[model samples]
Target: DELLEKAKKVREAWDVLRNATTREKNKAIKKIAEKLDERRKEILEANRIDVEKARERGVKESLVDRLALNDKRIDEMIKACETVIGLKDPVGEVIDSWVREDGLRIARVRVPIGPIGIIYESRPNVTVETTILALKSGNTILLRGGSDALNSNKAIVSAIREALKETEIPESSVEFIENTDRSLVLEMIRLREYLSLVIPRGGYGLISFVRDNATVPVLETGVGNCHIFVDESADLKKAVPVIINAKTQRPGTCNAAEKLLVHEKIAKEFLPVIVEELRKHGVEVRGCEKTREIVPDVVPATEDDWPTEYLDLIIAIKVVKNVDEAIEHIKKYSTGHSESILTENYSNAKKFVSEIDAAAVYVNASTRFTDGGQFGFGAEIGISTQRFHARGPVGLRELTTYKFVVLGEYHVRE
Candidate 1:
């Protein structure tokens, strides 16, 4: 109730704020980043509480790893501010313009998408990003972070609020839903009239629940059942390193390759090297019949296995006849987050990049580039996998929607 009511206030404020040039909004974000840096210590202490609690509960090491906010992560958060500060501001800009036959001027102006409701997980960095992006776009944000990161999220929200207080930015432009109860999420999602968009940043379960439950439009941010295919034309030297990094450098991530598709031509020769590398990292390399011959200890994959997002040190391996089969298999199971095809062949790489129905398709590269920071958007609210308003890694521009305001000299309707 408060969020929707505040949303109306925030939207009205945006009408005034949007009148300012993109340069104005960009300036505000830079200030926000500066404020975040100033409050870095408090934010880190808050993060510690959540990390400590998570460990006491015996949460997986990977999860705690994601939750950790060390000097590097904190610095990354500040850098997000710096990066977003560099993006083209979307507010008040005319995306399209036209003049009617009767001389009625018209234009679609860039505008805020009113108020946004975000449900995120693990990372408290979003508290800074969503507020910065939302405010910069002249849109208001309603944040709901994961239960585990409640303290950290709240502390970071306080930091942003303090910035707003100091800068005289409208405080309500960024609101936090600190309720840890899952039911509150249902309520937040149900507040459709108040929330213009609902972005959930977590696993498929959270994403699917919102898809099935919410009346409001949603942007699914993560839990990619992603894949990486190694073609016969792949330079093993390049493909091996890329796949290893994609699978092992960060074992449990949406960007990490959960499944590896290999051309049958390379099953015998190439997989020995692939298996050896994965084994070194302790990735439970499961295999289909062909892959099992090389890595015999690999667990027999089941029907449900191909579709699984084992965001862990585990990978499903499948051997296919050619590039066509590899593409087809990934397409059938992919969550459209990040998929890659490794090949030296021009035609093969072209087809995979074009036809593979994924957000960020790579050729001879790691899927990890499927991030807003890497793409130069700075910090991201989420990596939208849905094919609606925004897809791929969402940064500042994705946080905004557009409207048109034209200056016509009191033109009368004909």
Candidate 2:
């Protein structure tokens, strides 16, 4: 009904936006950052209110962390916008142009995906980056940030909208879904006529519903049960730190190592060290058969434990015969978020990085580094632990999808 009309205007507006140069896109981004910087206090006040409400409601610490955008987060958001602005806009680039023998010439060109919808969780920065990415790629964003960040996200959206006004572009190019009824999300996802693709950047539960219920295609992103394998050739020194950081640094994250696969040879030495370190950080090391032998002070992992995204201070340890067995285990259980191998053996590390089917594969580093910002992308929508479209640290580039435009010259030589 009214959605189609709204969609048409957005489509036309994106056409105008797409014609913008890389410099123009950069200017818009810089302006957005400038506005956000100017409204830093108000932004943090909104965050504080959200935090207080979240705390009063007894929300989890990790959720609280995600919900609240403090002063540092505000600064980071501004920096992320500036970074995206600095990057070249990937639009209208001629993929190929040629003269056809059939008298018809064609060239393939890139265009935006009309209206990109992001149904995400409590991160205010997403409201900023998603807008920037969509704007840079010549796509309109229908952003619905998590309810907790309602005020914060609104403020960020306002700054961006104000920036768009300066450019004489429709601020609706970055539409924020303001309805907090929760039911509105269903309508947003179901509106295929308006939205080109819906990207859900939260936990699995949200994606499962969007995947099953929505008619429009979805780009699922976020944590999967990431794993790490410490092979026999791994140096104890290196393995211990990598495992420690993965399990303890931010144990309650998707990139945090949910499972630890130890080589049978080193399980004797490594299990105790890992268990002791993790326990010190309050992690309850869940053990498999052989692991129970080494660290008797642990819980037995159930079948459900294998592919679980325990965004907490816990880990499941499995002892394998060799790298082959470890690879097999991961392929079966990994949600494909990020996997890593801690081994000094260059060949095996190379083999693992090449073989493991994950969005990101690390060698001798914490799987925790499987983050967009850490990998040098400005900010992250989420890590797409899934295959199609995006499957890794989805930063500014990942939020975008490209189209092929063709160009040709007529040569009537049949």
Candidate 3:
């Protein structure tokens, strides 16, 4: 019943946002930035509580890393909101304009996609980031974060609402589901009249469950079983650093590389070079027969290893005969998230980028570039891997849809 009431309130807020000017929406988001600064200590304190509880419950360090927030993270949240406030407003912008033969003008204009429902886990920063993006796009959002971070989520939602009260925009524009019940997700996703679309940003399990059960439309985000292919002609010196950064820099993220594909011609040389660096960074390598032969200490990689998204300090390595073999291997195992090819050869680089069907494809670069913030979208809702509407980093523009507008003088069906 409480969820229903909140959904109705968000729907009301969504309606109010339709008539709001771009400046009005920007003001509301800017107010949130101000509030985040003023309430930094409170936000951190709430996050601290969430972290402590997760630790006490024996949650994994990776998840705790995601749940934990400090002063810098608080500042990041504020900066993200401020950045969105500075973005170009997509609402009411003319996407395309054309005149018909009979003196009728037609225009396709950008408009908000209405309220968005985001179900995520651990990352409290997502609460602030997603809300800021939604406001900038002139859309309202309904957030459902993990129960573990309930206190932190509440603090953020409270701060944003207080800020919203300062602007013409409705305070209910951002609603957080306070209920911790697991069943709530099943109910929230089906609220088609209230939510225009639902996005899930978590592990493969969460994404699979949402995909399997959702009655409303879903935009898949996260669930990265990302990969990197190091070609024979690749600069070994350059490949090592990119792979290290991609796998070990922040292994907890969805864009972090979970698999490594190397050309057999260079595997003997590259494996030892890269494996030593990965080991130094506390990464555990599980490799195929050829890679294991080069990196003696690496554990044997199983068939199951290929499709797994090990969101930790672990990477599966496979040595392929050629660039085609590498691409074929990736096509069989990739989750359509992010894939990269490290190569000096122009033909191989071009072929890999063209053939790899993932949300983000990199050449001679780390797969970590798949991030929305790194791509200059400020903070992202998520890196979308689905192909229906949004297919990459879901920033402000991707959150909106378009509507057709026709200007005519009594011209109807002529």
lDDT tens per residue, model 1, 1-414 = 654565566555555554555565666666667666787788889888999999999999977987878777767777877776676776666778898776678898766676778887888876776777777776777888899998888877887777665544566667787767777777778876577788887767787887778887887776678798999888898788899888888766688889999998888998888888889989888899888887788889998999988878998999999999988898789888899999889999998888998789898899888888788775677788888999987776776676666657778766
Q: What would the C-alpha RMSD of candidate 1 be, to one decimal place? A: 3.1
List per-prediction Cα lDDT, in the order shown: 0.79, 0.78, 0.88
The digit string of per-residue lDDT tens for model 2 on 1-414 reads 334454565666776776677777777888898889888887888888888999999998967987877778778878878777766555766667776566465676666666787888888887887777788777787777788889888888887888888875567687776666567667777886677888887767888777778877777765568888988988887677778888888876778889999999998988888888788889888989889988887899889999888888878888899999999999899877888988888889888989998888888888888877788776666677667867776655554555544344633445
> What order do you get sorting by lDDT, best first?
3, 1, 2
The candidate maximizing lDDT is 3
Best by TM-score: 3
Global lDDT for candidate 3?
0.88
Could you tell me which 10 consecutive residues in candidate 3 have the lowest summed lDDT?
376-385
Model 2 per-residue lDDT at 413: 45
When 1 and 3 are scored with lDDT, the better candidate is 3
Poorly placed runs, candidate 3 (over 4 Å): 40-65, 68-70
Cand. 2 Cα-lDDT:
0.78
